[PDB]
Design a protein around this nucleic acid. Structure first.
Ligand SMILES: [Zn+2]
Lengths: 37, 68, 180, 132, 138, 181
RNA sequence: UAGAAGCAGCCAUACCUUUAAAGAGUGCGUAAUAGCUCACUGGUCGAGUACUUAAGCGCCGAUAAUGUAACGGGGCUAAAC
């Protein structure tokens, strides 16, 4: 959704992971999902 | 309510908005002691000084200047 | 590394475990499961228990430590107690029925979905809106439950769809929640 | 970063030792699920009975008891356990514990009366026993 | 804006700016400073953008000191012209900053809030920065 | 007492390139002057200096030991690069260890004052106080709690609770350090 | 303020207390509450964990048109540094 270049946690429940070579944010608040461009 | 009792005692009807600076009145030491003794039923303190301190803290939160 | 990698593995009496040439066989009351183990990790059976360690301390080995510990543990818990993951079908006119080794799903689509059940896995019904997949392998059980859920993923406006029982669906509102 | 923790732990050990030396009889209660109101009422009853009930760290209490020659089973410290010291009415404290066990889920895990490690049965018998 | 109110000469030659800073490189009037990690020019207007950011983040907690003043004209020839006549005209003002210039100084607020505000300021400047506490007091 | 001791050894390099090489070897060039002696050129361990005196003030005093002698020195100067957190020279002013001397020492304000709580006005008239002691006992900074200081109260210089062998030196003993009006 | 009960918003939490420990309540959601949770603390288990700084290689950022086309190519995990 927020295919950005700076991916940061938005709330304290967001969590940072790295998948197949891209940096991603995963959270319960699906509105907070992210991946680095 | 302790706020209601203190407002009645000191003539306070509407709580002062700036309770930190805009004092709405003075809470006398003897009146605070009497109010704490009266309301000790609902207060879980074991010391009359502790009950009076609870009353005084409530008065400060309402904006009433503590009585010296 | 971390304590899950080193935590010892208890062996139930009815369950037998054996290690040989980068392979592990776990034979229990309900079945037999096999696993590959990589070279950098060593698995030992002693005193009716399973232990795992690493020849090296590269990070691949660090991760492998926990990975294989957990797998063998789930490999032993399966052969003793079996794995089971359940599902609920919620929605108007949604139904599930069973014939032999296949399930028939009525999920609003203009066609009634047939579903072959892969071998090694059993399916249990509770009326026509509750399912429970049981089997020897946790991986397979999860796979089947997931693929069934994908048949009709849930939705947030009314809870309709096929949900995991343990799952909590976040819910939105439609018309009347926006009432002014 | 560790001197402050050492100081806090030392102060806790000193306070607990003062309580343990002032208490003639002692007991440990597992009060898991004992609500805030239930705990407040039980503490008020203990205070009225002259006992002092409070939560003490298991490791600190075990070390302090080992120093003070308290050879009890560590199962008493297993589980969130409030230590209640009663020096005068051991029968009253045990009866209050039994009443709390009836009216809630609190259990009297361990007891130590006159240096005697009272198990579940001995503790229940003592609690049912009356005062002097 | 920030700009000198009177100049001897309206236009001056663009030097080459280089080397670290040997002066104005220490925290003087405050508690926390925003040192630069590059050598470059900071315009007056980026200066005031960073100042707004800091000041607005600080709810009256303390004071902000600006340790640079532009005083350097930046000329630009008209839009569509050739290379002929010479030294077109002042457009905006630049300040010189070198690696190690304190550039900004803050007083009064807790260290966490200062660090936040001053990253908020650094987001609007054209140079890498570093937030420094006095490193000899706390 | 160790935390006031500092190990050095002599250097004979004396060049810009030489000093750069030393700091690459993670040491700090330093010089010691005072008491009419010949200047002593030495070098210090950067890790040790950082660990011990990460908060050094103009009034910090310490002991230098070259394995063969002891010196009582003030940190007169320290050339710091802020960007790289890099010390790259130290000036040590030596004093006599047994000669009473004066020095302005800053104050450190602690506690929340009742007067300011109730509407007092901080006015920090004095940011430092002239004290007197032997060098090894000079206070790094003198503390002052304002909590009992109510409205309309000023702080007398004698009111400053002082370390053991430290003594006031101000000509005006009754001047006020901080007032709350 | 019409409703603020911790969560439109304002002043501070110089409110003590039974104090395990509990902020004038962290978030979600409630017209306002309710309700569900957090900080904090107790047990279980058992030593590194939690946040930064310096140096060497890295990742995304990285993206134009005749055809891979930014090691010469084949290829190389060193045949790289
Ligand atoms: Zn989130």
């Amino acid at each position: 959704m927020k295919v950005r270049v700076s991916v940061k946690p938005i709330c304290e429940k967001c969590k940072v992971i790295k998948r197949k070579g891209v940096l991603r944010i995963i959270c319960d608040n699906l509105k907070h999902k992210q991946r680095q461009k | 309510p302790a706020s209601i009792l203190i407002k009645k005692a000191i003539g306070i009807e509407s709580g002062s908005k700036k309770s930190n600076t805009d004092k709405v009145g003075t809470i006398s030491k003897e009146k605070l002691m009497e109010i704490a003794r009266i309301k000790m039923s609902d207060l879980n303190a074991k010391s009359e000084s502790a009950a009076f301190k609870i009353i005084a803290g409530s008065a400060r939160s309402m904006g009433v200047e503590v009585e010296k | 590394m971390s304590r899950i990698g080193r935590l010892p593995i208890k062996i139930p009496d009815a369950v037998k475990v054996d290690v040989k040439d980068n392979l592990v066989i776990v034979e229990g009351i309900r079945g037999r499961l096999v696993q590959d183990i990589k070279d950098s990790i060593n698995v030992k059976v002693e005193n009716g228990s399973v232990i795992v360690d690493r020849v090296l301390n590269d990070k691949k080995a660090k991760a492998y430590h926990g990975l294989y510990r957990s797998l063998i543990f789930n490999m032993v818990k399966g052969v003793t107690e079996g794995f089971s993951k359940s599902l609920t079908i919620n929605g108007i006119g949604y139904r599930v029925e069973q014939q032999g080794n296949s399930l028939f799903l009525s999920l609003g689509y203009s066609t009634q979905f047939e579903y072959v059940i892969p071998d090694g896995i059993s399916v249990k019904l509770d009326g026509n809106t509750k399912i429970s997949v049981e089997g020897i392998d946790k991986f397979k059980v999860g796979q089947v439950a997931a693929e069934i859920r994908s048949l009709k993923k849930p939705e947030p406006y009314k809870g309709k769809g096929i949900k995991y029982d343990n799952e909590v669906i976040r819910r939105k509102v439609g018309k009347s929640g926006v009432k002014k | 970063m560790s001197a402050k923790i050492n100081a806090k732990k030392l102060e806790m050990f000193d306070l607990l030792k003062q309580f343990i030396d002032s208490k003639q009889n002692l007991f440990f209660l597992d009060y898991r699920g004992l609500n805030v109101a239930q705990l407040t009422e039980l503490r008020n009853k203990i205070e009225g009975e002259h006992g002092s009930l409070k939560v003490v760290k298991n490791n600190i209490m075990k070390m302090v008891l080992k120093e003070k020659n308290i050879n009890v089973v560590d199962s008493c410290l297993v589980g969130p356990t409030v230590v209640v010291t009663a020096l005068e009415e051991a029968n009253v404290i045990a009866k209050i514990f039994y009443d709390f066990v009836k009216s809630s889920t609190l259990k009297v895990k361990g007891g130590f009366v006159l240096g005697e490690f009272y198990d579940e049965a001995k503790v229940q018998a003592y609690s049912k026993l009356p005062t002097k | 804006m920030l700009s000198p109110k009177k100049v001897k000469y309206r236009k001056k030659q663009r030097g080459r700016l280089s080397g670290e800073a040997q002066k104005g490189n220490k925290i003087s009037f405050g508690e926390y400073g925003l040192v630069s990690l590059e050598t470059n020019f900071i315009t007056a207007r980026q200066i005031e953008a960073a100042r707004i950011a800091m000041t607005r983040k600080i709810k009256r907690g303390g004071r902000v000191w600006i340790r640079i003043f532009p005083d350097i004209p930046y000329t630009k020839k008209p839009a569509e012209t050739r290379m002929g006549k010479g030294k077109g005209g002042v457009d905006h003002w630049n300040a010189p900053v070198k690696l190690g210039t304190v550039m900004f100084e803050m007083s009064g607020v807790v260290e966490e809030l200062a660090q936040e505000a001053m990253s908020l300021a650094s987001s609007k400047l054209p140079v890498k920065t570093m937030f420094v506490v006095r490193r000899d007091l706390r | 007492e160790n935390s006031r001791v500092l190990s050095c050894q002599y250097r004979s390099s004396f060049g810009s390139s030489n000093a750069r090489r030393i700091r690459a070897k993670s040491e700090i060039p330093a010089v010691v002057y005072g008491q009419g002696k010949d200047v002593s050129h030495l070098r210090i361990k950067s890790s040790e200096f950082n660990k011990k005196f990460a908060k050094f003030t103009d009034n910090t005093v310490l002991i230098l030991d070259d394995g063969k002698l002891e010196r009582c020195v003030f940190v007169k100067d320290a050339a710091e690069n802020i960007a790289s957190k890099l010390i790259y020279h130290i000036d040590f002013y030596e004093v006599d260890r047994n000669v009473e001397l004066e020095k302005y020492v800053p104050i450190k304000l602690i506690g929340a004052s009742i007067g300011v709580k109730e509407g007092g006005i901080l006015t920090v008239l004095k940011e430092q106080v002239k004290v007197r002691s032997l060098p090894l006992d000079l206070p790094e900074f003198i503390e002052l709690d304002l909590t009992p200081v109510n409205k309309g109260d000023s702080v007398l210089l004698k009111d400053l609770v002082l370390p053991s062998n430290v003594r006031l030196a101000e000509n005006d003993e009754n001047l006020e350090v901080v007032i709350i009006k």
